[PDB]
Amino acid sequence: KMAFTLADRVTEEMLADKAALVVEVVEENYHDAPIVGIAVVNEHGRFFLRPETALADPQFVAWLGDETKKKSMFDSKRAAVALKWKGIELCGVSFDLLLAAYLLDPAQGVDDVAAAAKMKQYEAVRPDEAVYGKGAKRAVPDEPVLAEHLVRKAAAIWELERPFLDELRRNEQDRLLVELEQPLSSILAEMEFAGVKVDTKRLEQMGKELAEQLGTVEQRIYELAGQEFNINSPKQLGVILFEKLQLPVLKKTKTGYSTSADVLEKLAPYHEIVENILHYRQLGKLQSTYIEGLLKVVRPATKKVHTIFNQALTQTGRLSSTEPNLQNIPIRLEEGRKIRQAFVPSESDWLIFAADYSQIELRVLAHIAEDDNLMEAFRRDLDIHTKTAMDIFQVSEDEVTPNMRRQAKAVNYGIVYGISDYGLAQNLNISRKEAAEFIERYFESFPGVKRYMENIVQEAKQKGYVTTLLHRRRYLPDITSRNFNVRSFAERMAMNTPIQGSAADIIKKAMIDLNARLKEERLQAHLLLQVHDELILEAPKEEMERLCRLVPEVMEQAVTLRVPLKVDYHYGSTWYDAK
DNA sequence: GCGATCAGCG
DNA sequence: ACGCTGATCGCA
Ligand SMILES: [Ca+2]
Numbered sequence A: 001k002m003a004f005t006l007a008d009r010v011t012e013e014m015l016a017d018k019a020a021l022v023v024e025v026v027e028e029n030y031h032d033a034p035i036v037g038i039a040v041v042n043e044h045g046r047f048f049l050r051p052e053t054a055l056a057d058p059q060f061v062a063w064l065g066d067e068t069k070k071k072s073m074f075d076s077k078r079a080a081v082a083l084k085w086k087g088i089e090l091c092g093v094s095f096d097l098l099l100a101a102y103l104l105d106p107a108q109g110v111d112d113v114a115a116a117a118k119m120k121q122y123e124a125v126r127p128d129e130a131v132y133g134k135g136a137k138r139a140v141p142d143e144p145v146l147a148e149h150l151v152r153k154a155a156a157i158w159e160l161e162r163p164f165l166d167e168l169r170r171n172e173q174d175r176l177l178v179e180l181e182q183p184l185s186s187i188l189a190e191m192e193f194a195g196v197k198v199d200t201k202r203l204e205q206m207g208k209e210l211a212e213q214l215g216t217v218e219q220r221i222y223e224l225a226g227q228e229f230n231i232n233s234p235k236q237l238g239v240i241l242f243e244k245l246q247l248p249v250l251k252k253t254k255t256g257y258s259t260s261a262d263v264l265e266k267l268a269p270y271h272e273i274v275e276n277i278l279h280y281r282q283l284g285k286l287q288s289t290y291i292e293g294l295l296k297v298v299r300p301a302t303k304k305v306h307t308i309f310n311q312a313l314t315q316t317g318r319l320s321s322t323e324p325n326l327q328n329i330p331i332r333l334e335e336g337r338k339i340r341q342a343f344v345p346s347e348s349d350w351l352i353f354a355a356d357y358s359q360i361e362l363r364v365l366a367h368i369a370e371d372d373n374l375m376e377a378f379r380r381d382l383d384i385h386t387k388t389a390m391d392i393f394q395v396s397e398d399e400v401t402p403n404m405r406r407q408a409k410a411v412n413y414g415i416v417y418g419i420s421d422y423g424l425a426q427n428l429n430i431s432r433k434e435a436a437e438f439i440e441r442y443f444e445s446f447p448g449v450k451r452y453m454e455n456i457v458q459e460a461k462q463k464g465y466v467t468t469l470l471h472r473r474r475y476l477p478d479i480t481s482r483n484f485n486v487r488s489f490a491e492r493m494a495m496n497t498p499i500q501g502s503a504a505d506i507i508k509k510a511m512i513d514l515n516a517r518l519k520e521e522r523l524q525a526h527l528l529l530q531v532h533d534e535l536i537l538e539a540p541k542e543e544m545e546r547l548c549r550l551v552p553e554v555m556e557q558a559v560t561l562r563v564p565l566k567v568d569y570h571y572g573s574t575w576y577d578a579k
Numbered sequence B: 001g002c003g004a005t006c007a008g009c010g
Numbered sequence C: 001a002c003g004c005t006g007a008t009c010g011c012a
Helices: A058-065 A074-085 A097-102 A113-118 A127-131 A143-170 A173-195 A199-223 A234-244 A261-266 A273-297 A334-342 A360-369 A372-378 A385-392 A402-416 A421-428 A432-445 A447-463 A482-520 A541-556
Strands: A018-024 A037-042 A044-047 A070-075 A091-098 A194-196 A309-310 A320-322 A350-357 A465-467 A473-475 A528-531 A534-542 A566-571
Touching: A018 A074, A018 A143, A037 A143, A044 A143, A070 A074, A070 A143, A074 A091, A074 A127, A074 A173, A091 A097, A091 A143, A091 A173, A097 A113, A097 A143, A097 A173, A113 A143, A127 A143, A143 A173, A143 A465, A173 A309, A173 A482, A199 A273, A199 A334, A234 A273, A261 A273, A261 A320, A273 A334, A334 A447, A350 A482, A350 A541, A360 A372, A360 A402, A360 A447, A360 A482, A385 A402, A402 A421, A402 A432, A402 A465, A421 A432, A432 A447, A447 A465, A447 A482, A465 A482, A482 A528, A482 A534, A541 A566
Parallel strands: A018 A070, A070 A091
Antiparallel strands: A018 A037, A037 A044, A309 A320, A350 A534, A350 A566, A465 A473, A528 A534
16 A cells, blocks of 8 residues: 565665665664664655665665765664674664654653654554564564565655654754764664673672572571561561561551661661661672673673663653663672672773763752852862761761762752652651751752742743753643642652753763764774763773873863863773772 | 562762 | 662562
8 A cells, every 4th residue: 555666686776865764673672683674765766675685785785884875764773783783884864753753752652653653643654563563472574564564664754854853943952853862873873782891700700609698698587587488578578577576667558568778777776687688688689680680681702781772761861771771780889889890891901981970960950040059169169969968967078978978969959859858857867847947948058949940840830841951851741730749740850850851961962072082083992881970981001091181071061051060080990990 | 560679870 | 748760570
């Protein structure tokens, strides 16, 4: 019901200098995954290609790698990375319908061409799920069904570029797509394909020593509990703590007794068992997620892990990392932080270089709210978290422990993002009127932040959305809901999203500037990971001293704010040592 | 499949 | 009753 050529060979009219291209990878994880078909729509017509012929044709391969041949795509990072696993470079992507839909409305959840197309009343294409099936029924259909689905996606992309571009322009989002999100997409592709090298012997050795500490703590719990149980069974664990040992019930869940770490810490005066249960969970988390979980996804021949950075998922414009998540590798507890010793450079006498922004979101907040005292504090490079710990625990800067600082950190962001006196008292273990008086005092010193929090909520009520400094957008229909709880959650989104989102815009700008600068200095250094406000690279040890001057400066100059941006940096033999 | 939980980011 | 995530696991 749509006309196209089922092509055998590649012809010159398939290689026009502007086209919609579909390079279909059905597997969710596209690393080293099969390419099942190719479709091209251009001025000359519509074409389906079998990949075993087009990807071995030198004229088609050259066309893919020629940046003057412009391609409109959906999810071009997926195609680019699977092509790299075929030894093929894709260049010239001038429109990515996934990123365009994500900028226009991140809450759509647009996961395929049909879902983006529906945004513009275009419906002559089917959902990917209806063509391939789901779960155990997933299959590549017969070639004519596949060829028509891929051509319909390409024709949809061909039609939808212009209406998407013109709405992006009306939102002031068109330079965000073309100068930020599309260039970042190619940089993520390289990072994911390069991967990160893992010391599997060291990981395996820690997993052995963990399995032995786990058993010990486990017997000390059973003995403290009188009997044995499934320490992972909330039914059983709840029965032990709040019936057998008769500990107080401080919190319930929708299913029963709460056993979260916040509760278990408040019960430590009552019984020694709760601190052993905490230690047990922590050692079990390291074992399942970060030992077994990481060994499960290492590619054995190279000892590399290849994450996928989802660029069109978070409601704020942050990235996320999946399979493995390399953005939540432990760091705070000493036992967990040693996991970072297994992350090593991919070549001998290379090193890991990490740089990160200091207090990025409070600096963004200072700039956006134009708070006099908050701006002045950062013009003095004050460490607000340490300063806040001193104020809370009535100590000196000498006696600010890392746990007090991390505590003050949660208070600093909590207050500006709408923490209540109740919530503050539960976090500090102070009375509820002391928490409220503290909150009033903090807004006495930063009235401009208070004003911004009110202004941004009223602006979200009247506009229907909030924006970031580079014009990312988030719609907030619930901001006018009549239900008090639903409306309150939306108000705190209006306070938080412009700040977190602007901080995501800034570090994405830095990654793009950094790559251009690495290239102009002809350095071998390349990005491996982004962790929200941190960039991790690897480079020959001979480039470290240049990177100590280049990277901080690039990051600090990514944008110009009314306060300076501050960047800390370390390097060494493993990720562990690069802090 | 989902909720509770916990690892990270602010 | 601060916000944004992803992984594991039990299942109330
Ligand atoms: Ca930081």
